[PDB]
């Protein structure tokens, strides 16, 4: 409105139209993809698949934890 133009918020406030919002949006997209990198490696290292799938799956490429929990008497 009127005073809201002098109010700072993280979400931008009412009717936020930053001039460079496209270059900002793409910089955000590059950042999130960068953060999605360590998450994927940690997930692939932490995933556990006790059963071999009936058919090959995308995860039989990046994940090496298939059919490893068969000796569950040794779990500790």
């Amino acid at each position: 409105g009127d005073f809201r133009a002098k109010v700072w918020s993280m979400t931008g406030g009412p009717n936020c139209r930053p001039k460079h919002w496209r270059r900002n949006t793409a910089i955000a997209m590059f950042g999130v993809f960068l953060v999605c990198i360590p998450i994927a490696k940690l997930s692939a290292k932490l995933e556990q698949r006790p059963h071999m799938p009936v058919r090959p799956i995308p995860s039989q490429i990046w994940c090496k934890n298939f059919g490893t929990k068969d000796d569950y008497e040794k779990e500790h």
Partner: protein, 90 residues
């Protein structure tokens, strides 16, 4: 300064403790309380390891878990009775 490694404790119960009269040897009464706590923690971690076996038995065997994990369930349930400081005294 402390030497590198895990903590070490005496494996056996302190001689000098008298179960009929525990407020007779002050030093032993304290080392006995510490020993009992350490022993109970071993039982708690004993059951926790038995809990992990049941978990992966259920996950590996699927709908065949009732017939296949029958023994591990029995062992784990027996260990959790009279464990730690929960609903069982001794």
């Amino acid at each position: 300064g402390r030497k590198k490694g895990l903590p070490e404790f005496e494996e056996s119960a302190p001689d000098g403790f008298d179960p009929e009269n525990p407020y007779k040897d002050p030093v032993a009464m304290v080392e006995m309380r510490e020993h009992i706590v350490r022993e109970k923690w071993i039982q708690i971690e004993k059951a926790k390891i038995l809990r992990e076996k049941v978990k992966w038995c259920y996950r590996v065997e699927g709908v065949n878990h009732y017939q296949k994990c029958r023994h591990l369930v029995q062992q784990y349930l027996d260990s959790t009775r009279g464990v730690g400081w929960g609903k069982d005294h001794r």
